[PDB]
Amino acid sequence: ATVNQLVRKPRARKVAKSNVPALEACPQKRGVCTRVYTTTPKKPNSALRKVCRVRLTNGFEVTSYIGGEGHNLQEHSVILIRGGRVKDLPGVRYHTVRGALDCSGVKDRKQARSKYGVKRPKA
Amino acid sequence: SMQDPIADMLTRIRNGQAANKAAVTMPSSKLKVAIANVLKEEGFIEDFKVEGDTKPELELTLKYFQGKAVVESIQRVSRPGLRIYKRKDELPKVMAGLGIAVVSTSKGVMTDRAARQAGLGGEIICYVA
Amino acid sequence: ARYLGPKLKLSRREGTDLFLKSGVRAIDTKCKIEQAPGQHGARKPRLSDYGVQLREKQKVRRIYGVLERQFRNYYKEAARLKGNTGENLLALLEGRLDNVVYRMGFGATRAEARQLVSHKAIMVNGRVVNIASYQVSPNDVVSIREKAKKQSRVKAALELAEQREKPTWLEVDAGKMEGTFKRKPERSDLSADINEHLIVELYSK
Amino acid sequence: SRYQHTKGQIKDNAIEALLHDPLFRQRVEKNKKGKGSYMRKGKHGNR
Amino acid sequence: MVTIRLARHGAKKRPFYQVVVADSRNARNGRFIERVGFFNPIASEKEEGTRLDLDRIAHWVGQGATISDRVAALIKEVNKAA
Amino acid sequence: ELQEKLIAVNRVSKTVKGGRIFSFTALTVVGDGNGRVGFGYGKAREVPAAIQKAMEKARRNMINVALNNGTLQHPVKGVHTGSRVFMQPASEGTGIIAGGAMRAVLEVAGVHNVLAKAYGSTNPINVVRATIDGLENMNSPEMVAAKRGKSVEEILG
Amino acid sequence: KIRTLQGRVVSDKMEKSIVVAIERFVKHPIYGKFIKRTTKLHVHDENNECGIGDVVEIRECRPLSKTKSWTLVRVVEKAV
RNA sequence: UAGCUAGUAGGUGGGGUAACGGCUCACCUAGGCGACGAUCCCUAGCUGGUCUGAGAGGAUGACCAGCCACACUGGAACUGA
RNA sequence: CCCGCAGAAGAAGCACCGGCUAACUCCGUGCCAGCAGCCGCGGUAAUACGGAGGGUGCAAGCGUUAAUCGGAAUUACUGGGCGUAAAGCGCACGCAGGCGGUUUGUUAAGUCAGAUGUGAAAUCCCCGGGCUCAACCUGGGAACUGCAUCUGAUACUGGCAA
Ligand SMILES: [Mg+2]
Ligand SMILES: [Mg+2]
Ligand SMILES: [Mg+2]
Ligand SMILES: [Mg+2]
Ligand SMILES: [Mg+2]
Ligand SMILES: [Mg+2]
Ligand SMILES: [Mg+2]
Ligand SMILES: [Mg+2]
Ligand SMILES: [Mg+2]
Ligand SMILES: [Mg+2]
Ligand SMILES: [Mg+2]
Ligand SMILES: [Mg+2]
Ligand SMILES: [Mg+2]
Ligand SMILES: [Mg+2]
Ligand SMILES: [Mg+2]
Ligand SMILES: [Mg+2]
Ligand SMILES: [Mg+2]
Ligand SMILES: [Mg+2]
Ligand SMILES: [Mg+2]
Ligand SMILES: [Mg+2]
Ligand SMILES: [Mg+2]
Ligand SMILES: [Mg+2]
Ligand SMILES: [Mg+2]
Incomplete structure (x- = not known):
């Protein structure tokens, strides 16, 4: 705090960690998506979260979250991973872009359809 | 031992008024008189005395316009651990002009307003406010 | 772009006449314009501190028919244009040609003036223009193309301007249907109620 | 679709083994009044 | 070889040339010794469309500069006072 | 009123x-x-x-605290127990831009100005008592002329 | 008048050379303090007269060696 | 990452480059850098500027422009101002 | 760029509505399906889920991730703390380093002022113009917080001397 102490050891600006290790921190990534399973949340919540373990193109095997209502994913069929941890799941720090590669949009969805990638009811 | 006796002068001025005293006495030197002469002109104080042959004791008489002291805050600026030397274009305007900022210019120890009239720059001693 | 929906609904949220359908009627006198903002019309809102600061800025845009993207650039321009920013923001919105044609009286509404200016009918300094956002410089003239003279709308809108405040920062002749912008409007020269300091503080954060 | 439970191998019983999984944990409902029914703001805090 | 040529600023189809003292190796808009004046071809009745320090150009042509053809013909248009 | x-x-x-x-x-x-x-x-x-x-x-x-024409006099530090409140004159800067609870105590004072940033812990009871302490700790051009210098023409220009 | 610098000799024996070090006062650009700072040079001198720990005068010359371009002008004192 | 360096620090004479110089040799003297951080490891083109910020700073340097570096990888020389 | 058409004719969507943060209620599902940025909502009267009515925020663009800065005075030089919230080394001696009472003389490195050279142009900023005007283009200045040299001031700081 003394000025003579700051010319010696400068005011060391700490650095924060990146919330998502998406490697070079690029908007989305593409992974093959092995092991599509379900999980139960933390203590206050109680549900059956649709979770997938994505083998990213970098080489990582981070897990992701299929946010939506209906999913038709398999042990393959590449998907597009988007940042954002949920809250109540351990280790889940990514989302799935519904409406991309082989991840179809949510059937029966007409209120936030750009989220979840539903086209439009034509008129 | 004391490092900057000039910062001791302001400490006598601050604590003297805080204790509600009529006058204070401190060991004298050239600069303590020179800043007192600035404070005497500016009205922040009543007359001083440097009476004493071998041990000059500087004796400032404090000033109270009302029940509250006149010298509200008197902050040392160019302390020895961090000496500041501002130029003509960046002399501070303490309390937007409602307080002085005593500078030591090459032409002498002056207030900031008179040194700005003089067009000089120097060591920023204190912020008498 | 431009808001193209129901016009009184904008004036219904502000609880005041935004002159969007300003003509030979009072309000409409029959559709509840005092207090029935939407469906929940009896629901009297409290309007927290942000909701007041938003609503004042929303009032001005609905008056002058501008959009947020172009409005923020007026704020940036007003903030560098010396002096009181809030008056300068009012100096710019009054400087729009789209407002000038309205104040001259050729517009029944600014929406009529927006169509009239855009459909190649108005000439500033003998130069035809189409931009609604033309900043009318001081000591200039505004006029109409003669093929746009006698359109039976520039007549009808001009009569209603007699029932207006007759602004003094600009004068108008009605012979050859042209007017002259004279000086910048002062803050006290108009509007008397449209707050400006709430707009500055909104963008101040 | 397939529930991932927290036990690697399963021997001698499926339904009974899932009974000691956190899927079938006890769910205690936080009561609205009485013991353990205090809330800071609740669901809509307008005063 | 030092020469006095033109740059090409401005937008597409609306150019603003700049009479510039540059070595004749660098590109159209590259490094230059000293920008001396300008030019505006699509200028009609405004300010000048062409203003350039003829006292400076004589200082360069004496040292060994080369006046480019479009430059010399524009100097010819603004000879000394005509 | x-x-x-x-x-x-x-x-x-x-x-x-x-x-x-x-x-x-x-x-x-x-x-x-x-x-x-x-x-x-x-x-x-x-x-x-x-x-x-x-x-x-x-x-x-x-x-009752005096003020120039709708703005504060000089910068002032209204510190009180949880907050290190700072208010700056802001000459004709036409905005009462200030924090929560500092906007209210100034726009009822008749301030159509001053910038203000609430350092320290924001706390409504304290930040109100911070500025109330802050306005009281502000001096008039005549007031500082009264105690020292003795000419408002002298001390100000 | 030609450019020249003072400085005190730190290292002595170099076989027809010497090493000086100039104390210079730099205001730290962030914190602000007139910090004493030292730059070492390699100073040539014919007649190796000046020893160690003495204030000399150097001027910048044509480079006489690998990172050695300074030379001696005068000497204010040799030793007390 | 705490000791690092032996053509390395410097001198005398020869040679060499457009040009000074360990740039390169012979001999000689042992020094040189080092907590104001040497060597080593990792990462990275630099600057005008750019994005933010009240300011101070922080982060980053695509386009436009200056400089440097490279031209399948490694190395060398010729021609030529 | 200017003129003509029995022609409004070819051109409006996108998130959000518990609070933070503008914006309200009903049906369907009942801690199941799902929402999320944070606090946390859903357990058969949900304005927080899904779908409709309206409402708001923006608009040929919105919304979500991603990166930096701001908010963050949560790296504090401007501008923070250390009895108990994280923090005074167990204590002391002590080199380098940092700072240092008072008087006078001197020098003028630090400091301050003025001039010169340079600080490329462009960009940013301020007055002016030009494409129907704005983005953009652009003339003239300011600025480029700097560095160096020279000439002065020389109180304060430093060196030297008594
Ligand atoms: Mg637009
Ligand atoms: Mg009571
Ligand atoms: Mg060399
Ligand atoms: Mg040799
Ligand atoms: Mg590229
Ligand atoms: Mg380039
Ligand atoms: Mg080159
Ligand atoms: Mg090769
Ligand atoms: Mg029709
Ligand atoms: Mg939602
Ligand atoms: Mg709902
Ligand atoms: Mg952050
Ligand atoms: Mg703290
Ligand atoms: Mg404890
Ligand atoms: Mg202790
Ligand atoms: Mg010591
Ligand atoms: Mg100077
Ligand atoms: Mg100069
Ligand atoms: Mg113009
Ligand atoms: Mg320009
Ligand atoms: Mg300057
Ligand atoms: Mg003296
Ligand atoms: Mg000192």
């Missing part, structure tokens, strides 16, 4: 034998638009009954 403004209203409890009793606390400020500001805290057991107990404590304890 006064322009009272409610700032914050919360709910404190006591915890007696069979439960806790939610007494409500209010925090209002009456003003003048001229320089007289006073905050009345108050608290009761009902919400509209607590502001009335806050309206009275405000009016009886208003402090």
Whole structure:
């Protein structure tokens, strides 16, 4: 705090960690998506979260979250991973872009359809 | 031992008024008189005395316009651990002009307003406010 | 772009006449314009501190028919244009040609003036223009193309301007249907109620 | 679709083994009044 | 070889040339010794469309500069006072 | 004529034998638009009954603090117990841009200006008492002329 | 008048050379303090007269060696 | 990452480059850098500027422009101002 | 760029509505399906889920991730703390380093002022113009917080001397 102490050891600006290790921190990534399973949340919540373990193109095997209502994913069929941890799941720090590669949009969805990638009811 | 006796002068001025005293006495030197002469002109104080042959004791008489002291805050600026030397274009305007900022210019120890009239720059001693 | 929906609904949220359908009627006198903002019309809102600061800025845009993207650039321009920013923001919105044609009286509404200016009918300094956002410089003239003279709308809108405040920062002749912008409007020269300091503080954060 | 439970191998019983999984944990409902029914703001805090 | 040529600023189809003292190796808009004046071809009745320090150009042509053809013909248009 | 403004209203409890009793606390400020500001805290057991107990404590304890033309005089540091409040003159900067609870105590004072940043812990009861301390610690050009220098023409120019 | 610098000799024996070090006062650009700072040079001198720990005068010359371009002008004192 | 360096620090004479110089040799003297951080490891083109910020700073340097570096990888020389 | 058409004719969507943060209620599902940025909502009267009515925020663009800065005075030089919240080394001696009472003389490195050279142009900023005007283009200045040299001031700081 003394000025003579700051010319010696400068005011060391700490650095924060990146919330998502998406490697070079690029908007989305593409992974093959092995092991599509379900999980139960933390203590206050109680549900059956649709979770997938994505083998990213970098080489990582981070897990992701299929946010939506209906999913038709398999042990393959590449998907597009988007940042954002949920809250109540351990280790889940990514989302799935519904409406991309082989991840179809949510059937029966007409209120936030750009989220979840539903086209439009034509008129 | 004391490092900057000039910062001791302001400490006598601050604590003297805080204790509600009529006058204070401190060991004298050239600069303590020179800043007192600035404070005497500016009205922040009543007359001083440097009476004493071998041990000059500087004796400032404090000033109270009302029940509250006149010298509200008197902050040392160019302390020895961090000496500041501002130029003509960046002399501070303490309390937007409602307080002085005593500078030591090459032409002498002056207030900031008179040194700005003089067009000089120097060591920023204190912020008498 | 431009808001193209129901016009009184904008004036219904502000609880005041935004002159969007300003003509030979009072309000409409029959559709509840005092207090029935939407469906929940009896629901009297409290309007927290942000909701007041938003609503004042929303009032001005609905008056002058501008959009947020172009409005923020007026704020940036007003903030560098010396002096009181809030008056300068009012100096710019009054400087729009789209407002000038309205104040001259050729517009029944600014929406009529927006169509009239855009459909190649108005000439500033003998130069035809189409931009609604033309900043009318001081000591200039505004006029109409003669093929746009006698359109039976520039007549009808001009009569209603007699029932207006007759602004003094600009004068108008009605012979050859042209007017002259004279000086910048002062803050006290108009509007008397449209707050400006709430707009500055909104963008101040 | 397939529930991932927290036990690697399963021997001698499926339904009974899932009974000691956190899927079938006890769910205690936080009561609205009485013991353990205090809330800071609740669901809509307008005063 | 030092020469006095033109740059090409401005937008597409609306150019603003700049009479510039540059070595004749660098590109159209590259490094230059000293920008001396300008030019505006699509200028009609405004300010000048062409203003350039003829006292400076004589200082360069004496040292060994080369006046480019479009430059010399524009100097010819603004000879000394005509 | 006064322009009272409610700032914050919360709910404190006591915890007696069979439960806790939610007494409500209010925090209002009456003003003048001229320089007289006073905050009345108050608290009761009902919400509209607590502001009335806050309206009275405000009016009886208003402090008359002078000011130039709708703005503060010099920069001032209103520190009080949780907040290191700073207010800056902001000459004709046409905005009462300030934090929560600092906007209310200034726009009833008749300030159509001053920039203000609330350092330290933001706390409504304290940040109101911070600026009230901050305005009282501000001196008039005539007031500083009275105690030193002795000419408002001299000290200012 | 030609450019020249003072400085005190730190290292002595170099076989027809010497090493000086100039104390210079730099205001730290962030914190602000007139910090004493030292730059070492390699100073040539014919007649190796000046020893160690003495204030000399150097001027910048044509480079006489690998990172050695300074030379001696005068000497204010040799030793007390 | 705490000791690092032996053509390395410097001198005398020869040679060499457009040009000074360990740039390169012979001999001689043992020094040189080092907590104001040497060597080593990792990462990275630099600057005008750019994006933010009240300011101070922080982060980053695509386009436009100056400089440097590279031209399948490693190395060398010729021609030529 | 200017003129003509029995022609409004070819051109409006996108998130959000518990609070933070503008914006309200009903049906269907009942801690199941799902929402999320944070606090946290859903357990058969949900304005927080899904779908409709309206409402708001923006608009040929919105919304979500991603990166930096701001908010963050949560790296504090401007501008923070250390009895108990994280923090005074167990204590002391002590080199380098940092700072240092008072008087006078001197020098003028630090400091301050003025001039010169340079600080490329462009960009940013301020007055002026030009494409129907704005983005953009652009003339003239300011600025480029700097560095160096020279000439002075020389109180304060430093060196030297008594
Ligand atoms: Mg647009
Ligand atoms: Mg009571
Ligand atoms: Mg060399
Ligand atoms: Mg040799
Ligand atoms: Mg590229
Ligand atoms: Mg380039
Ligand atoms: Mg080159
Ligand atoms: Mg090769
Ligand atoms: Mg029709
Ligand atoms: Mg939602
Ligand atoms: Mg709903
Ligand atoms: Mg952050
Ligand atoms: Mg702290
Ligand atoms: Mg403890
Ligand atoms: Mg202890
Ligand atoms: Mg010592
Ligand atoms: Mg100078
Ligand atoms: Mg100069
Ligand atoms: Mg123009
Ligand atoms: Mg220009
Ligand atoms: Mg300057
Ligand atoms: Mg003297
Ligand atoms: Mg010192």
